[PDB]
Subunit: 187 residues, 2 copies
């Protein structure tokens, strides 16, 4: 609980950048319930799967399958419009006007936690909390604090595998896997 | 990470109230270094001991011994002027304009943490973080976030004993224990 928060965050983000292809399983706990997903990430490309939904993004084109409709929608999201659900992306707030502090919690041996506090009272989330291991700089949990309501959103990283290699085709939707689906192309 | 923050804080504070005499050993970690102390608490009376300093308060009169001067100063602090260093006192901020959220952290099995965020941008500390066990509602750690600087203050509760009975005389300075000290009475 000694080091500088920005330095720890930069080391954590850099190691993620250099990690190659990643497979990250996560759980989201909210007010209203809990759900899990899996993210496969390499460069700007991703695949994300949750119950009844799967999305592929190849760096330009996004395909999103919705099981309850047996429909795949095709689009070209702007960099802001993307929804990778990558918990490591929350580190980037330190460059968008969130002030930082670093401390340490333990009981299980200690981890760092980093507080991110919006300098702008209009921004939502108002605060973000990151729980990061001390030795290996691995993100275990991200908590999001909404400005205008009382309940925290918790994102837990359940498993994290690095150094994967995904073929380009992994990030491109394959209609043969979805024989009955309707394709709805918004491009 | 489901229950309401105020309810958890109230249960924690109430159990402390009903605990009888308490002996609480603590460690404070700051930028500049670490130090430990022991607090003995019963009602409004306390004794607090740190390296080279000991203070007795009997509900009205405070005696404070400073080893580096071999001097005991006697005063009558107002309720604001007291310095019990009781970590449980930080819970009281929820009644002084700090907004609350509740979540849960684990790796070691999980504990609650409660965030306290000053609604008034002038107040210091800007934020306080409480780490409280889920079953026994015991405060393990309090972190203080200063408004205008970057470093967190951490208070760890190292041991906590309840149901003690202290005689009134325990909280009254005894000159026989300090044969050479100069008494400086400011009353």
């Amino acid at each position: 609980q000694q080091p500088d928060a920005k330095n720890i965050l930069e080391r954590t983000a850099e190691a993620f950048r250099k990690a190659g292809g990643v497979k990250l399983a996560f759980t989201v706990n909210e007010q209203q319930g809990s759900y899990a997903g899996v993210l496969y990430l390499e460069g700007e490309k991703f695949v994300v799967e949750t119950e009844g939904m799967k999305t592929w993004f190849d760096g330009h084109t996004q395909w999103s399958y919705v099981a309850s409709a047996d429909e795949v929608n095709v689009s070209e999201p702007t960099q802001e419009e993307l929804q990778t659900l990558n918990p490591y992306a929350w580190l980037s707030l330190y460059k968008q006007g969130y002030r930082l502090k670093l401390s340490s919690v333990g009981g299980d041996k200690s981890v760092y936690y980093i507080t991110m506090t919006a300098a702008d009272k209009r921004k939502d989330p108002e605060s973000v909390y990151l729980f990061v291991t001390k030795d290996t700089y691995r993100l275990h949990q991200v908590d999001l604090a909404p400005r205008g309501s009382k309940y925290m959103t918790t994102i837990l990283i359940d498993s994290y595998q690095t150094g994967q290699s995904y073929p380009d085709s992994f990030f491109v939707f394959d209609k043969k896997a979805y024989p009955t689906a309707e394709v709805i192309d918004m491009r």
